[PDB]
Amino acid sequence: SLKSIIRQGKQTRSDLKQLRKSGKVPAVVYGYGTKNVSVKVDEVEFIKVIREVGRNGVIELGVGSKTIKVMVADYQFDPLKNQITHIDFLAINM
Amino acid sequence: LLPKRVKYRRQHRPKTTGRSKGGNYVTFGEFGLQATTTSWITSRQIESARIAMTRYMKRGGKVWIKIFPHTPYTKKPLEVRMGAGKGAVEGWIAVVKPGRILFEVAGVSEEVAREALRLASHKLPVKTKFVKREE
Amino acid sequence: AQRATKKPKNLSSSEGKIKVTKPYFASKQKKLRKTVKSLETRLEKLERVE
Amino acid sequence: KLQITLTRSVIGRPETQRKTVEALGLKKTNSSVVVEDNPAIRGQINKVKHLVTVEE
Amino acid sequence: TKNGRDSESKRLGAKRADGQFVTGGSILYRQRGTKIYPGENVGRGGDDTLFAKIDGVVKFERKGRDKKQVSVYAVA
RNA sequence: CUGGUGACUAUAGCAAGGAGGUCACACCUGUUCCCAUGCCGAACACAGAAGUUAAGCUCCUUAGCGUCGAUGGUAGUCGAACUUACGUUCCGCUAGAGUAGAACGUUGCCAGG
RNA sequence: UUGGCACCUCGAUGUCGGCUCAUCGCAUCCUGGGGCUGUAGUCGGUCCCAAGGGUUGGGCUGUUCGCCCAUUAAAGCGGUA
RNA sequence: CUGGGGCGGUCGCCUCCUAAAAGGUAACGGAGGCGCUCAAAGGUUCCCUCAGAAUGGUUGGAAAUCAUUCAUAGAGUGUAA
RNA sequence: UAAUAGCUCACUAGUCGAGUGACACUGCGCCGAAAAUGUACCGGGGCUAAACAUAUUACCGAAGCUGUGGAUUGUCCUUUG
RNA sequence: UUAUUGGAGGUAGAGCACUGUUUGGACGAGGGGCCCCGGGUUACCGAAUUCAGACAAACUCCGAAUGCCAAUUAAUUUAACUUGGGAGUCAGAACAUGGGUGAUAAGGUCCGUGUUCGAAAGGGAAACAGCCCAGACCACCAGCUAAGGUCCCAAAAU
Ligand SMILES: [K+]
Ligand SMILES: [K+]
Ligand SMILES: [K+]
Ligand SMILES: [Mg+2]
Ligand SMILES: [Mg+2]
Ligand SMILES: [Mg+2]
Ligand SMILES: [Mg+2]
Ligand SMILES: [Mg+2]
Ligand SMILES: [Mg+2]
Ligand SMILES: [Mg+2]
Ligand SMILES: [Mg+2]
Ligand SMILES: [Mg+2]
Ligand SMILES: [Mg+2]
Ligand SMILES: [Mg+2]
Ligand SMILES: [Mg+2]
Ligand SMILES: [Mg+2]
Ligand SMILES: [Mg+2]
Ligand SMILES: [Mg+2]
Ligand SMILES: [Mg+2]
Numbered sequence: 001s002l003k004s005i006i007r008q009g010k011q012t013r014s015d016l017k018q019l020r021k022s023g024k025v026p027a028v029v030y031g032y033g034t035k036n037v038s039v040k041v042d043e044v045e046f047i048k049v050i051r052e053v054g055r056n057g058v059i060e061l062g063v064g065s066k067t068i069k070v071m072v073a074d075y076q077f078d079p080l081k082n083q084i085t086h087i088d089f090l091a092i093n094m
Numbered sequence: 095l096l097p098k099r100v101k102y103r104r105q106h107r108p109k110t111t112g113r114s115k116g117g118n119y120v121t122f123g124e125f126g127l128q129a130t131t132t133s134w135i136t137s138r139q140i141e142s143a144r145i146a147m148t149r150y151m152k153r154g155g156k157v158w159i160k161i162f163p164h165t166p167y168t169k170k171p172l173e174v175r176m177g178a179g180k181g182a183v184e185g186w187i188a189v190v191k192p193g194r195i196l197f198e199v200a201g202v203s204e205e206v207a208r209e210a211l212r213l214a215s216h217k218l219p220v221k222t223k224f225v226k227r228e229e
Numbered sequence: 230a231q232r233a234t235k236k237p238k239n240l241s242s243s244e245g246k247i248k249v250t251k252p253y254f255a256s257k258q259k260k261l262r263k264t265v266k267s268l269e270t271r272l273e274k275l276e277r278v279e
Numbered sequence: 280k281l282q283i284t285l286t287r288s289v290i291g292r293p294e295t296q297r298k299t300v301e302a303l304g305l306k307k308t309n310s311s312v313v314v315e316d317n318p319a320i321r322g323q324i325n326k327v328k329h330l331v332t333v334e335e
Numbered sequence: 336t337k338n339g340r341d342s343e344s345k346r347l348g349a350k351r352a353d354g355q356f357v358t359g360g361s362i363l364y365r366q367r368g369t370k371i372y373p374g375e376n377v378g379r380g381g382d383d384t385l386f387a388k389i390d391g392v393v394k395f396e397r398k399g400r401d402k403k404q405v406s407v408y409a410v411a
Numbered sequence: 412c413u414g415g416u417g418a419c420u421a422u423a424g425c426a427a428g429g430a431g432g433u434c435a436c437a438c439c440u441g442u443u444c445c446c447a448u449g450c451c452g453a454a455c456a457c458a459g460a461a462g463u464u465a466a467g468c469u470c471c472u473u474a475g476c477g478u479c480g481a482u483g484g485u486a487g488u489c490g491a492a493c494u495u496a497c498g499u500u501c502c503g504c505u506a507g508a509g510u511a512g513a514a515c516g517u518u519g520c521c522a523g524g
Numbered sequence: 525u526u527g528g529c530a531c532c533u534c535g536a537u538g539u540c541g542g543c544u545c546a547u548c549g550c551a552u553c554c555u556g557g558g559g560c561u562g563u564a565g566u567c568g569g570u571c572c573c574a575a576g577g578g579u580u581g582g583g584c585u586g587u588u589c590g591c592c593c594a595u596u597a598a599a600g601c602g603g604u605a
Numbered sequence: 606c607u608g609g610g611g612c613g614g615u616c617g618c619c620u621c622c623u624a625a626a627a628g629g630u631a632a633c634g635g636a637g638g639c640g641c642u643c644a645a646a647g648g649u650u651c652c653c654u655c656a657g658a659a660u661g662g663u664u665g666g667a668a669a670u671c672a673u674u675c676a677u678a679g680a681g682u683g684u685a686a
Numbered sequence: 687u688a689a690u691a692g693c694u695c696a697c698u699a700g701u702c703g704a705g706u707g708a709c710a711c712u713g714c715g716c717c718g719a720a721a722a723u724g725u726a727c728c729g730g731g732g733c734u735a736a737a738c739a740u741a742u743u744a745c746c747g748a749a750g751c752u753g754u755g756g757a758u759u760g761u762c763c764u765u766u767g
Numbered sequence: 768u769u770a771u772u773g774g775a776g777g778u779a780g781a782g783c784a785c786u787g788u789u790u791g792g793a794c795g796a797g798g799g800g801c802c803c804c805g806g807g808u809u810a811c812c813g814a815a816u817u818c819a820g821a822c823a824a825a826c827u828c829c830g831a832a833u834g835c836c837a838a839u840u841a842a843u844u845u846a847a848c849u850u851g852g853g854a855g856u857c858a859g860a861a862c863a864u865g866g867g868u869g870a871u872a873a874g875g876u877c878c879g880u881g882u883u884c885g886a887a888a889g890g891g892a893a894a895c896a897g898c899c900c901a902g903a904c905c906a907c908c909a910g911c912u913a914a915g916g917u918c919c920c921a922a923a924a925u
Contacts, residue, residue: 014501016484028483030511036482055229073510076484077228079118080130080193082711086484088510097788104635106623106824110497110871112486115781121820122791132497134871162789164822169870173527176608176869176876178633179336188822191497195820230612241589243540246525250539252609259611266612287913288750288901291882295768296490302768302844308901309751309912312843319770319842325503326769329491338635342619348627352836353774364775367620371775393837395774400420403775410839455652487780488832495863497871506831507781529608529875549722603722608876622825624879625865626778627835631878634868636825658815666797679785686825729893729920736918736925745916746923748890749903752911757904 001053005063006040025084029061029070031091037063043084061089069094095137096186097164104180108165114193119228122158123200125207126225133219134187135196137163143197143214150210151202158198161188190220230261280335284311287330299326353395356410361387363405372398374406 008026011019016026023043030036039061049059050072060067068091076086110132120126140159147157163186170181190196197214199207208224215222234254236245285305289297303323304312314320324333350362357363364371364385373379374396376389387393391407398404 011483012502026484028510030482032511036511038483050229079128079225080113088483090511099788101787102636102823102825106635106867107871108823112497112780115486115821117821119820132871156791158791158820160790160821162822164788167870176528176633178608178614179338180634180868239590241587242525243588245589247540255609255611262612290901291899293881298844299768302842304844307751314843317770317842319768322769323843324769326490336614336633336635338637339615339633340618340637341621344629346628349775349836350628352838354772355774355837393774397420486831489834504832506779507829528869529873531874547723549720551720623867624778624824626776626831626833628776629879632868632876634877731918731920733918733925744924746912747916748901748913749888750890750901750913753909754907756906 001049001058002060002067003041003045003049003062005061007064008038008040011038020083020085023083025087027087027089029063029068029089029091031070031089032093033068033091039063039089041087046084046087058092059089095140095163097162100164100166103166103183104168105165107167108187108189110189110191112191114191117160117195118193120195120198120225123156123198124227125200125202125204125211126160126195126198127211127214127222128225129190129192129194129196130221130223132189132191134167135161135163135190135218135220136188137186139218140188142217146213146217147197147199147210150213151206154201156200158200160195160198161190163188165189195225196220196222230258230265233258233261280313280315282311282313282334283324284309284332284334285330286332289330292330296327296330299323300330303327305331351393353393355393356391357387357393357407358390359387363387363393363407371395372402372404374404376407376409377405 006024008019011026019026019040024040025043025046027039027041028036029039050057053059056071059070059072061070062068068089070089070091072087073090074088075084077083078085118128120128140161140163144157144159148155165187166183167185167187168181169184196218197211199210202210204226211222211224283303283305285300285308288308289300303314303320324331345365347365347367349364351357362384363377366383366385368383369379370383371385373385374394376387376391378386378388380386385405387407389407389409391409394406394408396404396406
């Protein structure tokens, strides 16, 4: 239940498109703890973890600070292309 | 397949650019048919495709059509100079943009579903692919 | 007048492919319809009476 | 402060763009004009940046 | 055919913008019904036009989320 | 704090539960004159205060409905460059829906305590 | 082909058939070469290659078309104002 | 006037959409109305707030009228939108 | 085959002596592809790059721009230029 | 002209909150055909309600970019209006885009926007009014570049 993560600054419809072509998904993490962060995550890792621990299992997200306990509130997914396009991580209470 | 009643029989013919406003994620059944390209689809094509699937499958089977031709279209009488109004109705169309699910099917295995929706794909003006549900 | 423009029956290839005479027949049709206009004019010129 | 060269013509370009060109003070192709860095003039750049080459 | 008609257009809408100086009796917003209501020093005509009554400055305004208004305020 | 009366996009509301009263407001006692109901003092209006907090009113709590509502991402799009493909590429703006969330009002003047 | 458009032609681009003379295309009527056949054989069906040459005379009708008499290896489909 | 002319249709006015979030915008593009009405259906002052559903009730869709509760607009606005 | 019968496939065991499959997204390409004067939609020769994609550096290339000289009409300087 | 501020407006999108359309379900509101006053039904389901998914130029709880209207504002620019004299024009075309009609046909037709042509020569597209680059006072056996290109025709990289 682990994802290593990158933080992203501002983005455009070319930087973002190149990431999501490379196979890195953008996401945010917001909720109970920290304020909000915009992140890159790896599509394959995220897929494996969700096939492992379920559609709503709990996840440890290593944003770059220490791991944050999160779950998936929503995911924007691209049919005709079969890839994930954006993710929302709801940092849960304790 | 027609609507029973409509306010305006002579409409503008719809837009074909863009992508689906919806009808993309397979919802009812287990398997579905997904357009990769844009065209129009009629009562006639739908009846044919549905017949094809329902014959290929035994009485064991359940189908959900996911489109309906609300929009009519016109054609003028034959051998007529242009202008002088707008022609009568000759059909009814559902527009299809890539993404959208045309048919959904439940009560079978994936091989049977593949062959049925394959048989149907050849009776539409659209390139299709075979879809399963998501997570 | 409506008959004036429509092809006859059992007219074959060469005669059917003929296409020069369309204006002749269209003018003949206009003549007969002009005559209906004349009669309708007379009908209006009739002294109505109740 | 910066100079602005009209490196690319206005034949086949709309009248909006042509007007910005005149406002800037460019009158022929490969003509240069020296001005300051007002954002009012950065907008005049951005309308016609594809016609123009700026140097500082 | 049984169609092919339409009426003259009537040039509805705003006729003096916001933050603009306006003399008395000046039309602001021709309309049909209270698409926009009056405010201060504004009158509503029989055909629902909105005319200033005093010289001043125009300000379109809010009147509760489905209702605008317009006020001509003096200047100095 | 109560009452009156304005102002603000319902963040103010709806709903449920609970609470208080002779100093307010209420219900409430009657048609006695003013006054009044296509019929009735229900209402309106008046002479009132024996009576009751039940209700209206006001106050406390709750986020079920309504309302408001980011970031991020997306559709779309002015402009530009390629090309005619039910289009693509770059920049700038930028939704709608939703998600987290906000919120069970806040003030201004006046008379009372 | 029946149609749409109305770009050329209005100080003129002359119609239908027939005669004379041909020419190109092939989506081949015949002859040639083949695969398959629900091809026993003769005959056939169909499809692929192939345009070298050939591809009828009369009756009716102004007629092309079409029907008919009689043949033929076959009585081809079309473009060429 | 007119996708030749002609027939058919139309010719003036009003309202929507086409109409590309100012305005304006054409076609033999799509849908509808007008050539009136009202001495109150005007002016003013007072007061009132609907339609529809559930339920109860005689002549019964309990649809007539009634009573209550719900219901913020789906009624009505002389007459097209 | 008339059922038989005959014979195979699956299923396995034995030889070997390294790879072997099935799912999806993609890039470039293959047939589908038959018209009428003559190759007859690279302009031609011709090209397996002299094509395509990506990156870079040089260059040609207009009556554009610059350099030089001249004419004209204006504006600023300026007596005169 | 741009920057900034403000404002009117309901488009593309999106959505189903009304208007109409529509799929599959859960109930049903009570009828109907048929059997014997009542009761049945492998059935329409007129409806009501509800869960999920969907359609709209003449639906919108919502709502862009642009464009528009102005401003006691700043910058760059050089036009604007009025009065009078004199005209011509009222057959327009292609291209790109947003849309209608047509057949999501036309070198079609009719509107919005823009460019070009007309009235504009020159370089590329083989040739080719409208495509791309670009706006010719004149001369020059001078140079830099655009679009487009560099094997030979045919100038520049085999
Ligand atoms: K197909
Ligand atoms: K002529
Ligand atoms: K010009
Ligand atoms: Mg009036
Ligand atoms: Mg024309
Ligand atoms: Mg001559
Ligand atoms: Mg003879
Ligand atoms: Mg006509
Ligand atoms: Mg014509
Ligand atoms: Mg408008
Ligand atoms: Mg020059
Ligand atoms: Mg839309
Ligand atoms: Mg709309
Ligand atoms: Mg034309
Ligand atoms: Mg001319
Ligand atoms: Mg030229
Ligand atoms: Mg050079
Ligand atoms: Mg050379
Ligand atoms: Mg080389």
